[PDB]
């Protein structure tokens, strides 16, 4: 799936100032506990691709960074 990655302690996203191709978000976005296989800065946000159903996106059911 696709969707924000999100920081399991805080429930926060990941922020990201340069938009668009983003090796900062691809690197967190594929890393082993991510799984995901693709991630570019989108609204100032990490958003990743092909994730697994296992990893969770925002936002976090019981963990509020809003």
């Known amino acids: 799936k ?3 990655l999100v920081n399991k302690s805080t429930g926060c996203k990941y ?3 340069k938009l668009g191709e983003n090796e900062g978000c691809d690197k967190e976005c594929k890393a082993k506990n991510q799984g995901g296989s ?3 800065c989108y609204a100032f946000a990490c958003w990743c691709e092909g994730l ?3 990893t969770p996106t925002y936002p ?3 963990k ?3």
């Open 60 to 62: 976090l059911p019981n």
């Open 38 to 40: 693709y991630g570019y």
């Open 2 to 4: 696709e969707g924000y």
């Open 15 to 17: 922020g990201c100032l």
């Open 64 to 66: 509020s960074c809003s």
């Open 52 to 54: 697994p159903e296992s």
